[PDB]
């Protein structure tokens with residue numbers, strides 16, 4: 116991120132990147148896993164479990180919200196579709 | 205108001221090309237629903253219009269209907285039907301139960317359709333004879349998808365592979381890929397007599413053959429609809445009938461919460477973490 | 478080994494009655510797959526066998542197919558197709574996209590089928606004339622489900638309510654409930670001209686009428702299949718075609734991640750919590 | 751362009767009140783993410799902010815954490831864990 | 843006891859029905875007339891639950907409560923004195939009676955066209971008994987510039 120923030124300046128380490136790298140480095144350098152265990156966990160999919168878990172709170176909080184605000188069925192604006200159907204099939 | 209008289213522009217997302225409900229009638233591809241019903245095309249016809257956006261010939265529509273019927277159900281011991289039964293037996297709604305059973309349809313359960321079609325198409329398009337394709341699968345340590353049955357082997361056919369195969373022979377004009385798959389079947393049945401074409405493999409090869417053998421597809425559309433996942437779609441749509449049937453069955457038999465026997469678990473927990 | 482010679486007993490859970498995978502042939506209700514294909518019953522026939530466990534008459538099978546075709550798709554703006562397009566446009570698999578769109582099918586989207594059938598059945602079974610049912614619904618502060626269209630009102634029919642209605646008239650033997658629904662439609666169109674029967678209401682009343690008007694149902698089975706949710710099942714199975722079509726469309730158009738515009742949100746967060 | 755100078759109106763759907771990402775910092779209820787972390791309020795606190803939109807007292811946050819930990823798992827034989835095991839064992 | 847000042851700049855109204863176009867027109871008229879508060883305090887729709895409708899106050903978004911009953915709408919807004927009855931020709935009569943059972947409502951504007959004349963005469967009699975001013979059981983409304991505007995009268999801005 117020093118080599119890439121030299122290029123454009125907004126090319127910094129995103130929260131994704133940071134969590135990713137810091138979890139690979141807590142899994143590998145903390146004392147409990149053995150760098151093969153700690154590389155199964157990365158592959159089986161244990162970092163998509165962190166993201167999922169986190170989002171889950173926010174997701175539920177957007178259910179609990181739109182239910183407190185009593186919002187109704189959403190019919191998408193049709194001016195925001197642009198049907199491109201074929202001529203006659 | 206500013207858009208009705210058109211002094212402003214907004215970019216429209218969600219390009220769509222399979223249905224138009226704004227207007228006098230529903231239009232699936234370019235075909236009004238009244239014309240859909242007047243030309244007597246069935247469910248296969250509306251899969252042709254919605255999925256592939258084409259007015260398929262009559263035999264293609266009837267074959268799509270046929271492969272939906274053979275896929276409809278294969279008993280409750282299967283993993284997806286197991287999940288549907290478990291969720292239906294926990295008091296959940298139809299959509300949740302069907303959904304929980306559908307979420308299993310992937311690579312290991314329900315993936316033989318698309319995998320068998322991809323494998324046979326890649327073998328056939330690269331000009332490998334069946335005797336060399338079988339050996340090249342063997343050298344790679346890979347089994348041929350779409351070939352292999354547990355019990356019904358020889359003078360004991362799948363009895364629904366036979367129905368589909370007969371339909372393909374009498375009605376399709378040309379089957380370059382089904383013939384290749386049948387040669388591979390002959391070789392593998394010479395190996396072991398129960399290595400016949402699955403229904404999961406015959407539907408895959410016959411659907412690829414229908415896409416690139418009938419009209420209206422240009423072999424760059426036919427090879428794209430396979431990659432996108434139209435065969436996963438056929439398996440899911442066919443097996444939704446069986447999963448909803450299992451939901452209705454378990455909900456009509458009035459059966460309560462399932463709790464797996466502890467004797468069929470085996471807890472291998474660590475000593476003290 | 479101990480069960481093969483039968484010296485032991487284990488209780489079997491998961492009673493099932495819609496498919497027999499084991500044995501020589503697939504058996505849906507009691508009728509093997511070869512007989513299913515030889516008797517030329519289509520997808521409607523296998524819904525009869527798997528869902529209701531009965532060999533329905535030909536017009537019932539064709540009507541089930543018809544109501545699957547009318548339900549297949551209704552454009553991308555509706556909520557479920559919106560979810561399918563959003564999830565397909567985020568790079569997910571067919572099953573995940575169809576599943577995320579199906580999970581919307583509930584009471585507010587897709588619930589007019591079963592609700593309209595339940596409401597009209599409870600009206601007709603309790604011996605209320607249509608003019609008193611309309612006034613009771615008005616008195617209770619409740620709208621009639623299955624009645625009401627946005628635009629297509631009079632000398633402007635739904636053009637697919639017309640097709641279904643014509644099929645029901647020319648082929649069903651007796652329609653005590655469709656006639657009641659049409660009288661309620663006459664009253665409500667006297668009120669306001671776009672309060673015609675929906676397709677969502679006509680399918681519901683015609684399906685209840687088919688269940689309790691054709692043979693093989695005892696009105697204790699016909700009234701149970703409505704309560705269990707067979708009409709939710711028909712909507713889900715019909716709309717799966719449209720949702721998979723939307724997945725294939727959005728995946729063929731090669732469209733990328735959708736992020737909602739910030740100017741269409743109106744954040745209303747508290748001041749400082 | 752016509753909305754930047756504001757000669758037009760469009761009604762905005764999706765009223766939301768649990769997060770705002772448009773701006774300098776993430777804001778959960780009304781308090782920025784930096785204030786969330788500086789006040790040492792944990793996962794129970796961010797459930798308080800996102801779900802109930804309130805800065806709950808410390809004991810309620812710790813109780814929310816506690817009831818999340820007791821709920822975490824109850825073996826594989828129960829129905830939901832059965833479905834998760836079946837679907838995970840099918841390669842999904 | 844019919845009053846002479848029907849509409850003031852402090853007048854607020856209760857709109858009977860989902861007439862969001864008419865209520866938006868009223869709010870636009872209120873804003874362009876330099877009024878400090880909207881003239882629509884609540885809306886009454888018997889066919890849906892109690893929620894809030896999102897409207898415009900010039901540029902701003904405001905929330906106008908929608909009630910299922912007339913009673914709770916009347917109690918939560920005790921200073922409302924005008925009711926604009928957007929009911930149909932077969933539901934304006936009983937709605938107008940129920941409104942006139944509330945003493946705070948000083949005028950009712952009935953927009954429905956086609957009420958039978960016997961029911962209209964009953965409305966007139968009970969309004970005269972209760973001192974309420976019914977502005978026309980076939981009208982579009984009455985517009986008092988700078989002050990108030992009933993429904994769709996005048997048109998769009």
Ligand SMILES: CC(=O)SCCNC(=O)CCNC(=O)[C@H](O)C(C)(C)COP(=O)(O)OP(=O)(O)OC[C@H]1O[C@@H](n2cnc3c(N)ncnc32)[C@H](O)[C@@H]1OP(=O)(O)O
Pocket residue numbers: 342347348349351352392395396399
């Ligand atoms: C009284 C007495 O019994 S004493 C008699 C003494 N004699 C004996 O005991 C002999 C009995 N045993 C045998 O003959 C058998 O050959 C056995 C048991 C050793 C093994 O037989 P098989 O089951 O045919 O072997 P296997 O299970 O490997 O399968 C055979 C082939 O099927 C192939 N195959 C299996 N599934 C698939 C698939 N899905 N796709 C493609 N190929 C497949 C395998 O690649 C294998 O290929 P290969 O033969 O080229 O390696």
Ligand SMILES: CC(=O)SCCNC(=O)CCNC(=O)[C@H](O)C(C)(C)COP(=O)(O)OP(=O)(O)OC[C@H]1O[C@@H](n2cnc3c(N)ncnc32)[C@H](O)[C@@H]1OP(=O)(O)O
Pocket residue numbers: 615620621622624625665668669672859928929930931932933953954955980981982
């Ligand atoms: C130039 C000029 O314009 S000056 C002319 C001056 N005159 C006027 O302005 C008159 C114009 N306005 C009217 O006449 C109209 O009647 C209005 C706008 C006041 C209201 O009309 P409508 O839209 O018919 O009323 P509404 O929306 O309440 O619907 C009518 C009925 O449909 C019923 N309805 C609606 N949806 C459903 C449903 N899904 N199921 C059952 N019933 C339903 C409602 O119950 C209502 O019943 P009710 O009449 O028994 O209460």
Ligand SMILES: O=C([O-])CC(=O)C(=O)O
Pocket residue numbers: 278282312313314315316404
């Ligand atoms: O189709 C599949 O992949 C799984 C299946 O039905 C079977 O058990 O044979």
Ligand SMILES: O=C([O-])CC(=O)C(=O)O
Pocket residue numbers: 551555585586587588589677
């Ligand atoms: O069927 C439904 O309930 C929703 C629907 O398709 C529509 O927008 O008309």
